[PDB]
Symmetry: C2
Subunit: 330 residues, 2 copies
Amino acid sequence: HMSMYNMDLDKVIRKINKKGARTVGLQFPEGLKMQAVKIAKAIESQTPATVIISGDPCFGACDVSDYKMKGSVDLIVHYGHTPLPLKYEVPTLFIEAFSNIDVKKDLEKCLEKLEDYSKIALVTTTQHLHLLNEIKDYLEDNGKEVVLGSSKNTKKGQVLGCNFSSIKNLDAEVYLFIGSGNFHPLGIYLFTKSPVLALDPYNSEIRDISAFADRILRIRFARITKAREAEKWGIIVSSKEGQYRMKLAKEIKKILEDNKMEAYIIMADNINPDILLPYMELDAFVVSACPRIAIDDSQMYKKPLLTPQELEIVLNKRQWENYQLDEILF
Amino acid sequence: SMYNMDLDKVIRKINKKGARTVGLQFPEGLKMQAVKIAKAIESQTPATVIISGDPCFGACDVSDYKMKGSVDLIVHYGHTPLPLKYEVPTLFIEAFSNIDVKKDLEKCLEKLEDYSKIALVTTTQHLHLLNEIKDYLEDNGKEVVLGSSKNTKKGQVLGCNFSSIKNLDAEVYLFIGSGNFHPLGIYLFTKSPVLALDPYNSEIRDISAFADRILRIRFARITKAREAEKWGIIVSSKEGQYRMKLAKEIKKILEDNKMEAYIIMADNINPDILLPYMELDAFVVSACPRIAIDDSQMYKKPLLTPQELEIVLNKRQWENYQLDEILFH
Ligand SMILES: CSC[C@H]1O[C@@H](n2cnc3c(N)ncnc32)[C@H](O)[C@@H]1O
Ligand SMILES: CSC[C@H]1O[C@@H](n2cnc3c(N)ncnc32)[C@H](O)[C@@H]1O
Ligand code: SF4
Ligand code: SF4
Ligand SMILES: [Cl-]
């Protein structure tokens, strides 16, 4: 009852023992790191392995610790994300850490919020993927047509903050997102221009995303207005394997120099305000790393941080009506 | 400029090597010069510059793993190289301080009146000042000795390697530079008088000024850690700081003393990354030895060196306190 997520310890331990691993790395996103010692203690009690907890941030499957842990561990257990189509330097076991939730209490609330629509797309992220089939079957049992988008690199019904490909060609009347966060509903909204609803399986509240979307876009507009006065730019690259986009960074550099501005590529692992402070000549920054940084963290930075698409608006190459979130595609 | 950035030589080196992409690595105090240097390199060579934005604390902290495949050459400022196997070819630039030390020579001599045999000690960025200081003291009746070690040049130390000052037998040690850590280590290893000249602001400080407050802090942290029942052992993935063998030995030792211990690996260590390990009462740092000593004020829970843990477990007497060192990599 106390476990908010299924950490699948039984499976993790059986696989550790069968693999014969003697040193095992653990990676957790921010919301799961509090469980690291409990899980490490269980693994060490039931296997001959020594656990190495990765204390570094872990923002997604773009951010596996295989480069840093190469030579230190035989196996990495990575929680919270499904794997990206990358080749990892160290054997890695991905545990979804599914939400411990019964959504049956909310099915009737969802049906009433959907009374005006026949054709419904269901979307969520990794830790609620296990709920989609129950919701889909309920809706279909109540006269609805339910579609789950897929892609070459995302599971049925799944989006990532940098990959909305699976919701782009669905032709639904309404998109129901499962989750408390607003960034994924924002991208579904902007790409589909269709109604987007979102169920918080904890609040049991269903919300419309249109209001949050306009609030974010007003902020993006104000940041872009400031960036139009920029003369010298930083282009931010991350060395994180799934985030690394040096080809794009060099393309952006040439574009800025073609527009008679200075531009300098800066590469870091974790991006934060403190690492940008020394470069006092730079007026604004374009992020070639995680597409969510410029949108979700912008209030932490004094100077404007922009996506490449937003840089296109600065340069009058993209119009506001075609505002678009950044994505990473493999 | 405050430091000789040796720009003409870096540019000469880039062109001869034919580098198309060049990485730049700076410690904190030099990062603000990154844009001017990138601008000059890109103006005078065909290369594109990548500024390493990550924190950089020493030669232990080269970005050759992160930059691997991105750059043909790395220019690294402010440090002398460590005996590591650098993946990407690297060019180390000392970044010597742009200081004229003449104004402080008589003041140094005045503070050294009681002594005949004087050791001079400094770090990379002030090594170029030592000859002028040494020659002045010798013109004024002093015997001046400079220590050396296999990897550290004449008169130089680092925060994890004090071997060059352990066999000098001087009456007093004059450290050139800011900060308390290096003079604290000289004092602890020699138990001799140690004076420190900060060449930027010309202040000369004695032992109590850089050692008393810190030793009392360490003693208090040790006392608090005697109550700890569950431990974290911090390892760094940074090539020059990696001590996993030691970390695993410390884990086994703590388990022999009927306590729990968990190895946590991180790149950069900071208070925020220890907040989720709420069950842990104390930490032992098996990474850069300066972390536990210099940054203790940032962490609520005790962060100890391995030698301080020895004191907690009653395997080392407090009187035999010893700073941590990385002797082998
Ligand atoms: C919730 S996962 C997305 C968030 O993770 C954080 N994030 C992702 N990648 C990075 C990075 N390379 N550096 C710092 N923060 C990141 C940003 O805050 C982003 O909004
Ligand atoms: C001035 S170089 C020594 C300083 O660098 C910092 N430092 C060295 N290694 C690390 C690390 N792995 N993580 C965070 N800070 C470090 C510590 O603050 C120390 O006081
Ligand atoms: S949105 Fe950012 S953190 Fe999430 S998978 Fe994509 S790049 Fe990684
Ligand atoms: S003292 Fe620490 S920062 Fe300086 S070289 Fe040694 S390990 Fe690196
Ligand atoms: Cl690329």
